[PDB]
Amino acid sequence: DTCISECITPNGSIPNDKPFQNVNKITYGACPKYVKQNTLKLATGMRNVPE
Amino acid sequence: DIQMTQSPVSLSASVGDRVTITCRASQSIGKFLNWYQQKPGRAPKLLIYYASNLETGGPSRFSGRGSETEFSLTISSLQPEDFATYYCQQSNNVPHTFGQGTKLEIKRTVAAPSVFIFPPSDEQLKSGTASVVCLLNNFYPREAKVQWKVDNALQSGNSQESVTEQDSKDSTYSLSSTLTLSKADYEKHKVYACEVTHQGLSSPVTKSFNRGEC
Amino acid sequence: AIAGFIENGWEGMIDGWYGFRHQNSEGTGQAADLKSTQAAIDQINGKLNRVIEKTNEKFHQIEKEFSEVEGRIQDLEKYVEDTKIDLWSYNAELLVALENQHTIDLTDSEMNKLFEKTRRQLRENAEDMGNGCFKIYHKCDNACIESIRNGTYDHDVYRDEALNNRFQ
Amino acid sequence: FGAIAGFIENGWEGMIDGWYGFRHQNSEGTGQAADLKSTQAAIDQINGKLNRVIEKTNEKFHQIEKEFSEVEGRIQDLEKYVEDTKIDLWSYNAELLVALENQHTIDLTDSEMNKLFEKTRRQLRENAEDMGNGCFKIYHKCDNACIESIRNGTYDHDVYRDEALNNRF
Amino acid sequence: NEKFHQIEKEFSEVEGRIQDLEKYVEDTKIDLWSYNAELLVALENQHTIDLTDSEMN
Amino acid sequence: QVQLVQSGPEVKKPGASVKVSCKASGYSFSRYGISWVRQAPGQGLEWLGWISGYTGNTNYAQKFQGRVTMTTDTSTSTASMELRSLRSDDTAVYYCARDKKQGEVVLPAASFRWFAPWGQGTLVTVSSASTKGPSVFPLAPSSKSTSGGTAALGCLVKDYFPEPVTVSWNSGALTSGVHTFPAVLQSSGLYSLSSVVTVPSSSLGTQTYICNVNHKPSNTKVDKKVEPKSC
Amino acid sequence: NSTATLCLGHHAVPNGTLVKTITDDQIEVTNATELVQSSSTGKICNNPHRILDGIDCTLIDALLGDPHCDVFQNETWDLFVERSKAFSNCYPYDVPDYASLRSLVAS
Ligand SMILES: *[C@@H]1O[C@H](CO)[C@@H](O)[C@H](O)[C@H]1NC(C)=O
Ligand SMILES: *[C@@H]1O[C@H](CO)[C@@H](O)[C@H](O)[C@H]1NC(C)=O
Ligand SMILES: *[C@@H]1O[C@H](CO)[C@@H](O)[C@H](O)[C@H]1NC(C)=O
Ligand SMILES: *[C@@H]1O[C@H](CO)[C@@H](O)[C@H](O)[C@H]1NC(C)=O
Ligand SMILES: *[C@@H]1O[C@H](CO)[C@@H](O)[C@H](O)[C@H]1NC(C)=O
């Protein structure tokens, strides 16, 4: 396609705004590091205590 | 909530068979997966704890494996006592969530139902309501379809079904479908039929009666 | 009816992360603390930048999928790649676990800092009610509440009144 | 003559029913009682990290050869180098993990003791003074039922405030 | 860290498959250790600042 | 040995509150916790919450938050579960089970993060209804002898509350070919049930068939002779 | 009134997110971000790297000069993309150590 992306996987291009990636261990370019987890949630706020 | 998915939801097997049922978790739970057995009229009982551990006094033929997202329960050789419902449950995160359950049923040859139909007892109409009962007796397997037709008009939303558990001797099922109408609605029409479709017949069977004619 | 942070959080405070709720003669009011709110956000912004800071740029590598059985060399190519993935998967799991514990620790610290900063202002004019609230033992109007919130409260002005109210 | 003393540079070998607790001295004598909520709060955190260190399953099947009976050269040097690299990296991870874990466990159990002390400090308000050793001097007559009300968090400071302040000044 | 006979890490000729694997192994090692070093000093410096702040309090 | 004993069955109106108790023996009560699981009729298991016998701490499932409150008493080794603002949705069998070791750090395989043992179960029915007597209508053998040989006859028990009701044939004399179906809940809010038996059609002219419908919550005993329609 | 009350607190949200720490599998925080890229558009972007689509040709076929690969003569690339549909249509050939020749040409 006609777009800009630094990272290329056999599944297609992916963005690199995240440090890790679960798309494909085969990569080319500036890519996130391949890991086995499908999700890793980094807290961006304090503990949520309702009421 | 962590979703537990059991496969299969129903299983038919013979005594002496080797069976394996599967539990799947939506996210990793380590080895915090428990298995419970429930017999029809009793409370559930712990069978396997922490994925692989047999509860003390439990039968040696029961064993469990798995970790993370995939788990299994194995019965080396089936026994009469083992036909029951089996649930897997995760204890790693709160709320604790259960699987939908696997029902172990006795395998059997195919048997076609013997259909019966009953007009509303004359006293029932004297009270104001009318219940036509359509009986399917001693059939296997459980899957069956019952359709009510009143003067060839297919009915919907005015009937209830009830099925018994597998019989202790012949391991068949029995089903009762009850079409409920008001006495005013019941007297408006003539022929009342229930059509039954089942694996045990090459073509559906219809049993009917004419109102006020015996 | 009002209660502090020891008990729960405030869902109505959407202008900041930490703040004050008061009740005086003029009524009740709420106001967020901007400097402590941004102090926590600045630290969270920082770890988001550091988590992404190092670029991983790889070009020609080794083959990682194979269509034929070859044996020894292919066993080694697969083992190297599976070793790499398991170690990075460990690092990713450990990183967020450490980061999340620190985010929880620093945001708890900003709350305690603001409470102790207020405690030091009030001095002998106030008492700790135990629920994250202070009982100010003197008539404190709206302008008096603001002086606490902006750090210009002079305890000497109300010390005589407060001490008399504190001890019979 | 044994005077009681608190947690400042001092543990309690005599307390066996819990991890944290109270010791008191009043008109009826001396006593001791464990605090169950804070004991379990520290235990729950240790249990949780025990669960997390074991949560991943490391399941490997066919791999590479790691022992060799003959000298071969290039390919064998590479197989040995790969495995030696893997072991050194996992050994580092294992060493760093238990170091971070123990540091955090020591911190969180120290924190529970401080939380319990501050929780008690807030209850007593102006009716007691910090003796500096981990104990409170309660400036009013506090019988056994009064000690238990402090331990179970129903102590009302206003009941004794006049008596306590008169003894303080 | 005491290492003696290792693999070759620089090459004067193009060979293909085996050399591709030798280079990949060494680059993988260095990136993992470079990560370990970056995380170590970051964790340590955070703890040093914390413990010195604690001694004051 | 180790045992959990629950309180008796309950029937309640939609707006009301129910309180189930769980009595323990055979282990230190205060070293474990108790979880509460319910099972709707013909349904799977559903976790409500958990309470520690060591601390009194509780964990409730999000959907029951506000509605449930669980208490424990060490002196009587009893845990209780209160459910408020009931609904027909809450009609289920409620179980208690020992869960989670307390007072010491435990490795996972020794954590007791599993439900054992279970209580016998407490049945709670929530309906806008009052106890009422059953009504029985005969299901006479129809058709031309039904069939050449085997005929089916039965009894329909209708508009009764609450469950359950016994049914026997010829005062327990007939026990072969009988089928008593599980009750069904009508939109009227009252249950309904059928009990049938297959018998040789040649026996219809000589044998008398009477279904005995015995209901205790209303103290009702009805006997119904089922005879074929004569035209 | 002769006194006043001043409370200190922090914000909260109705529905927060679960995260993991060293000690807890799930803690509810007010907000979180995802660190694992798990989706793709399905398309390879042609910038900023020079992508050379093989189409019907493998790199070795274009090296040798299979007639239907003549379009690739003297070509260059940052990334050569080989497709499943590729096929040879010249003289039947065999390359001992095919993977090594493919690697050094592609590099
Ligand atoms: C990417 O493609 C591979 C097969 O080449 C497949 O196994 C994987 O699931 C795909 N992932 C995504 C995110 O499309
Ligand atoms: C702080 O608040 C008081 C009361 O409103 C006001 O008089 C004073 O000017 C404020 N100071 C600053 C620096 O905002
Ligand atoms: C707390 O202790 C006091 C004094 O023994 C007692 O009166 C009160 O009932 C206790 N409260 C609780 C909740 O245990
Ligand atoms: C020490 O820890 C182990 C598990 O880490 C636990 O099983 C054991 O009970 C502990 N010892 C004591 C005396 O509590
Ligand atoms: C959380 O709240 C949002 C509304 O902001 C709602 O759409 C969502 O379904 C809620 N999630 C849960 C799990 O209740």
Give the Cα separation of A14 and A24 in Å (integer): 10
Residue for token digits 């997390």? D52
Q: Tell me the CATH number for domain B1-108.
A: 2.60.40.10
Give the Cα separation of C122 and C117 in Å (integer): 9
CB B32, CB B45: distance < 8 Å:
no
Other C-beta atoms lying within 10 Å of the C-beta of residue F123: 17
Give the Cα separation of F186 and F188 in Å (integer): 5
Return the structure tokens found at D134.
Answer: 């981990």
Return the structure tokens found at B160.
Answer: 């209830």
Other C-beta atoms lying within 10 Å of the C-beta of residue C83: 22
Task: Check if C147 has its Cβ closer than 6 Å to any atom of ligand 2.
Answer: yes
Return the structure tokens found at C148.
Answer: 């606490």
CA distances (Å), origin D133, targets B118, D15, F39: 89, 18, 54
Give the Cα separation of B31 and D55 in Å (integer): 8
Q: Is D66 exposed, middle or buried (0-12, 13-18, 19+ CB in 10 A)?
A: exposed
Q: CB neighbours of D96 closer than 8 A, spacing ≥ 6? A: E36, E40
The one-character DSSP state at A17 is S
Interface test with E, best of D64, D72, D78 (most E CBs within 10 A): D78
Which residues sit opposite D136 in a β-bridge?
D130
The one-character DSSP state at C121 is H
Give the Cα separation of B175 and B146 in Å (integer): 10
Amino acid at E51: L
Amino acid at F89: D
CA distances (Å), origin F21, targets D112, F44, G75: 33, 22, 82
Residue for token digits 């209830």? B160
Using a CB-CB cut-off of 8 Å, the residues of chain G touching D108 are 23
Q: CB neighbours of C104 closer than 8 A, spacing ≥ 6? A: A43, A46, A47, G21, G27, G29
CB F151, CB F122: distance < 8 Å:
no
The one-character DSSP state at F30 is G
Burial C143-162 (b: 16+ CB within 10 A, else e): ebbebbbeeebeeeebeeeb
- Identify the residue whose C-alpha is closest to ligand 2 atom 12: C150
Give the Cα separation of B135 and G52 in Å (integer): 72
Q: Which helix (H) or strand (E) holds D168?
A: helix D157-168
Return the structure tokens found at B20.
Answer: 């394996």
Cis peptide before G92 (omega within 30 of 0): no
CB F202, CB F218: distance < 8 Å:
no
Sequence-ordered strand ranges (E) for chain E:
none
Phi, psi of A12 (to 5 degrees): 115, 180
Q: Which helix (H) or strand (E) holds D100?
A: helix D74-124
CB E3, CB C59: distance < 8 Å:
no
Give the Cα separation of F172 and B69 in Å (integer): 52
CA geometry: angle at B35 spanning B29 and B40, to 5°? 145
Q: Which of A6, C56, A2, A28 is nearest to G48 (CA)?
A: A6
The domains located in chain C, with CATH, are: 1-168 (3.90.20.10)
Other C-beta atoms lying within 10 Å of the C-beta of residue D37: 17
Q: CB neighbours of D87 closer than 8 A, spacing ≥ 6? A: none
Q: Which of B12, B18, B62 is nearest to B37 (CA)?
A: B62
Q: Tell me the CATH number for domain B109-214.
A: 2.60.40.10
Q: Which of C128, C126, C117 is nearest to C151 (CA)?
A: C117
Give the Cα separation of B207 and D33 in Å (integer): 78
Residue for token digits 């939609």? F14
Q: Which helix (H) or strand (E) holds B193?
A: strand B191-197
Give the Cα separation of C46 and G60 in Å (integer): 48
Helices E17-56 and D74-124, packing angle to 10 deg: 20
Chain F, window 94-153: residues with a beta carbon less than 8 angstroms from a chain D beta carbon: 102-108, 111
Q: Which residue among C76, C127, C166 places its CB closest to the CB of D64?
A: C76
Q: Which of G11, C101, C32, F58 is nearest to A50 (CA)?
A: G11
Q: CB neighbours of G50 closer than 8 A, spacing ≥ 6? A: G76, G77, G78, G79
Residue for token digits 């089916």? F152
Q: CB neighbours of D94 closer than 8 A, spacing ≥ 6? A: none
Torsion of CA B77, B83, B85, B90, to 10 degrees: -20
Give the Cα separation of E57 and E48 in Å (integer): 15
CA distances (Å), origin F146, targets B117, B173, D2, F50, F203: 9, 20, 97, 57, 12
Which residues sit opposite F211 in a β-bridge?
F169, F224
Distance from the first to the final alpha carbon of chain B = 58
Q: Which of F44, F8, F31 is nearest to F119 (CA)?
A: F8
CB B24, CB B41: distance < 8 Å:
no
Return the structure tokens found at C9.
Answer: 């959080």
Return the structure tokens found at E44.
Answer: 């340590």
Using a CB-CB cut-off of 8 Å, the residues of chain C touching D48 are none
Distance from the first to the final alpha carbon of chain A = 50
Closest alpha carbon within chain F to D40: F103
Using a CB-CB cut-off of 8 Å, the residues of chain E touching G101 are 16
Return the structure tokens found at D81.
Answer: 């180098």
Give the Cα separation of C24 and C79 in Å (integer): 70
Provide the 3-class DSSP secondary structure of residue B125. helix
Cis peptide before B95 (omega within 30 of 0): yes
The one-character DSSP state at C10 is B
Sequence ranges of chain B with CATH classification 2.60.40.10: 1-108, 109-214
C158 and G CB contact within 8 Å: no
Q: Which of D60, E16, A13, A27 is nearest to C65 (CA)?
A: A27
Give the Cα separation of B72 and B55 in Å (integer): 16
Q: Which ligand is nearest to the CA of F101?
A: 4
Give the Cα separation of C140 and B166 in Å (integer): 78
Greatest Cα pair distance in chain F: 81
Strand order in the sheet with F220-225: F165-169, F210-215, F220-225
CA distances (Å), origin F152, targets B133, B150, B181, F135, F196: 12, 23, 23, 21, 7
Q: Which helix (H) or strand (E) holds D146?
A: helix D144-151
Resolution, expressed in angstroms to one decimal = 2.5
Q: Are strands F122-126 and F10-12 parallel, antiparallel or unpaired?
A: parallel
CB E24, CB C79: distance < 8 Å:
no
Q: Are strands C57-58 and A28-30 parallel, antiparallel or unpaired?
A: antiparallel
The domains located in chain F, with CATH, are: 1-128 (2.60.40.10), 129-231 (2.60.40.10)
Q: Is D70 exposed, middle or buried (0-12, 13-18, 19+ CB in 10 A)?
A: exposed
Give the Cα separation of G51 and G75 in Å (integer): 11
Give the Cα separation of B172 and B164 in Å (integer): 9
Other C-beta atoms lying within 10 Å of the C-beta of residue A19: 24
Q: Say which experimental method was used.
A: X-ray
Provide the 3-class DSSP secondary structure of residue E57. coil
Give the Cα separation of D22 and D33 in Å (integer): 5
Interface test with D, best of F28, F51, F99, F104 (most D CBs within 10 A): F104
Return the structure tokens found at A47.
Answer: 């503990």
**DSSP of chain G, one letter per residue?**
---EEEEEEEB--SS-EEE--SS-S-EEES-EEE-EE----SS---BSS-EEE-TT--HHHHHHT-GGGGGGTT---SEEE--TT----SS----TTHHHHHHHHH-
